[PDB]
Amino acid sequence: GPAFPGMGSEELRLASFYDWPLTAEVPPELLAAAGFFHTGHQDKVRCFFCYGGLQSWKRGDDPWTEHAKWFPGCQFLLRSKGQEYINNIH
Ligand SMILES: CN[C@@H](C)C(=O)N[C@H](C(=O)N1CC[C@H]2CC[C@H](NC(=O)c3cccc4ccccc34)[C@H]21)C(C)(C)C
Ligand SMILES: [Zn+2]
């Protein structure tokens, strides 16, 4: 099961980005879709399922790509994107 079931909703995750500092650079919509919510501190985000945290986002970073790069064992990532996608990033 998810590490943090309470952030399993994409809409709740999107709502968490109300004070996101990088709107143009790394869209909240893409982050939320990729399982991430904003912790509220700097640009630190975390996946509701694997609880993997990421920060220091660069402009044009792709949330799904970063998810697979750093947390390839995440089952939310697997269910959403499939194994071929994860394999191709690694
Ligand atoms: C350039 N793209 C970004 C998304 C990226 O690759 N981020 C990386 C990144 O955040 N991580 C790589 C794998 C993990 C391990 C440590 C990094 N996580 C963190 O530093 C972190 C993220 C979110 C909340 C946190 C709260 C308290 C401490 C740390 C922390 C994360 C980077 C190491 C900072 C470069
Ligand atoms: Zn995850």
Please report which ligand is nearest the Cα atom of 86: 2
Backbone φ, ψ for residue 40 (5° rounding): 95, -5
CA of 35: how far to CAs of 1, 3, 24, 39, in Å? 14, 12, 19, 13
d(CA 85, CA 4): 24
- CA-wise closest residue to 80 among 32, 22, 43: 32
Q: Which residues contact 16 (CB under 8 A, 6 or more apart)?
A: 7, 32, 37, 38, 40
Contact 13, 7 (CB under 8 A): yes
Q: How many helices, marked H, and strands, marked E, lie in the chain?
A: 5, 3
Angle formed at CA 22 by CA 82 and CA 15, multiple of 5 degrees: 70
> Measured from the CB, is residue 69 less than 6 Å from ligand 1?
no
Resolution in Å, one decimal, please: 1.9
Looking from the CA of residue 66, the nearest atom of ligand 1 is: 4
| Angstrom distance (rounded) from CA 76 to CA 81 | 8
PDB experimental method: X-ray
Domains along the chain with CATH numbers: 1-90 (1.10.1170.10)
